[PDB]
Amino acid sequence: MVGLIWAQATSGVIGRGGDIPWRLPEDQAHFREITMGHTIVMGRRTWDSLPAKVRPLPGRRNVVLSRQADFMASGAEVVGSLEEALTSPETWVIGGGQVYALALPYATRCEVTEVDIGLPREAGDALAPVLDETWRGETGEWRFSRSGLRYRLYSYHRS
Ligand SMILES: NC(=O)c1ccc[n+]([C@@H]2O[C@H](COP(=O)([O-])OP(=O)(O)OC[C@H]3O[C@@H](n4cnc5c(N)ncnc54)[C@H](OP(=O)(O)O)[C@@H]3O)[C@@H](O)[C@H]2O)c1
Ligand SMILES: CCOC(=O)c1csc(C)n1
Ligand SMILES: [Co+2]
C-alpha cells in the first residue's frame, strides 16, 4: 500500500517558499498517527524543511528522494528513484509537490486535510496532485482548529 498524505488550502496550495503558510496542531497529530511505524518518503526539499532537531521523524523509516548521488540525510535513506523506497507493507509519501506527482501512479490512498484558508495560487507554489476519476472520495465534517482555521479530512481510495 502506497498512500499520499498532505494538507492543502482550498485552492490546492500545499507549499510556498519552501515551507507551509499554516500550522494546525490537529493536522500534525493526524499526520503522526497515520504515518507512525511506517515508511515515509519525501523529496529532498521537504527533508530540508524539517528542522535538524526533529529529523528523522521518530518511529518511521525516513526515505529521501534526491538526484544527488552523494546527498547525505543523517537518519534517512537517500534514494535516486522512488521505486527503491516501496519495499515495506505500508508506505506514506509525505511530500512535497514534485514527489506527490511522481508517486501518484503507485498510490491507492490519499489522506487530505483541507484547510479553510483563502490562499490564491502563486508562481512557485507547491500544489496538491490532481486526482482523476479512478479515485473515490469520503468527506469528513468541518472542524475548528485551535489555530483558528477550519479544516476537514478527505479520505480518497482506489483499487
Ligand atoms: N502537507 C503539506 O502541506 C506539505 C507536506 C510536505 C511538503 N510541503 C511543502 O512542499 C514544498 C516542497 O515541495 P517541492 O515540490 O518544492 O520539492 P519536493 O517534492 O519536496 O522535493 C523535490 C526534490 O526531490 C528530488 N526529486 C524530484 N523529482 C525527482 C526525480 N524524478 N528523481 C530523483 N529525485 C527527484 C530533487 O531533489 P535534488 O534537488 O536533491 O535532486 C527535487 O529537488 C515545501 O514548501 C514544503 O513545505 C507541504
Ligand atoms: C503538515 C502535516 O503534518 C506535519 O506536521 C508534517 C510533518 S513533516 C511534513 C512535511 N509535514
Ligand atoms: Co498505521
Automatic annotation (TrEMBL):
UniProt catalytic activity: (6S)-5,6,7,8-tetrahydrofolate + NADP(+) = 7,8-dihydrofolate + NADPH + H(+)
Keywords (A to Z) from UniProt: NADP, One-carbon metabolism, Oxidoreductase
Biochemical pathway: Cofactor biosynthesis; tetrahydrofolate biosynthesis; 5,6,7,8-tetrahydrofolate from 7,8-dihydrofolate: step 1/1
One function term, GO molecular function aspect: NADP+ binding
SUPFAM superfamilies: Dihydrofolate reductase-like
InterPro entries per record: DHFR (IPR012259), DHFR-like_dom_sf (IPR024072), DHFR_CS (IPR017925), DHFR_dom (IPR001796)
Domain of life: Bacteria
GO biological process, one term: tetrahydrofolate biosynthetic process
One annotated Gene Ontology cellular component of this protein: cytosol
Annotated ranges, domain DHFR: 1-158
EC number in record: 1.5.1.3
Similarity annotation: Belongs to the dihydrofolate reductase family.
Biological role: Key enzyme in folate metabolism. Catalyzes an essential reaction for de novo glycine and purine synthesis, and for DNA precursor synthesis.
Full protein name: Dihydrofolate reductase
Organism lineage string: Bacteria, Bacillati, Actinomycetota, Actinomycetes, Mycobacteriales
Gene this protein is translated from: folA
